[PDB]
Design a protein around this ligand. Structure first.
Ligand code: A1ANI
Length: 168
């Protein structure tokens, strides 16, 4: 039903909220939830671990069957699979891991995948252990994505820093 509420409007198409993406998916019932994935779709940590545990591991079981038949994704690439109990679909997107020297320019490629979907619930890509500067990730999202994106950031200090920086 895409019933998003309580978001700050950053641009005509980008919205942001201090919220847990799992709880937002349960409340909103979005058509598409984005996972911040890795190339072999191993959902052990970060956002991916939270989304997978909220599906009682159904996302990992499906991802393993996909990888066995199709092989790993490319950095900057994506894959639509089932959204299970969280959404109709999950768009698994691979942002670059700048802590491992992957090219930060591929963060643009990663957000470009959002343009195939009219409306998405998403986390900030390449944050956590992937090491991209969160303000830079938000700017690449705003400059790249043309469709409607609702960003859930589950850290109040980071949310406030991102909003303050973007409003300068
Ligand atoms: C209680 C269950 N929920 C959570 O643990 C949870 C966590 C959470 C969340 N975390 C953000 C985050 C953390 C790690 C991380 N690792 C990444 N790696 C790749 C491959 O891109 S991207 C990424 C993003 C923080 C920056 C805020 N963002 C929204 N919703 C959430 N929910």
């Amino acid at each position: 039903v895409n019933s998003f509420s309580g978001y700050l409007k950053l641009t005509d198409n980008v919205y942001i909220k201090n919220a847990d993406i799992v709880e937002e998916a349960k409340k909103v019932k979005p058509t598409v939830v984005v996972n911040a994935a890795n190339v072999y779709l191993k959902h052990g940590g970060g956002v991916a671990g939270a989304l997978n545990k909220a599906t009682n591991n159904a996302m990992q079981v499906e991802s393993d069957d996909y990888i066995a038949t199709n092989g790993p994704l490319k950095v900057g690439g994506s894959c639509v699979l089932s959204g299970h109990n969280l959404a109709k679909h999950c768009l698994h997107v691979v942002g670059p891991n700048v802590n491992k020297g992957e090219d930060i320019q591929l963060l643009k490629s990663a957000y470009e995948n959002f343009n195939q979907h009219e409306v998405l619930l998403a986390p900030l890509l390449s944050a956590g252990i992937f090491g991209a500067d969160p303000i830079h990730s938000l700017r690449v999202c705003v400059d790249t994505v043309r469709t409607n994106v609702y960003l859930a950031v589950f850290d109040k200090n980071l949310y406030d820093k991102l909003v303050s920086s973007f409003l300068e």
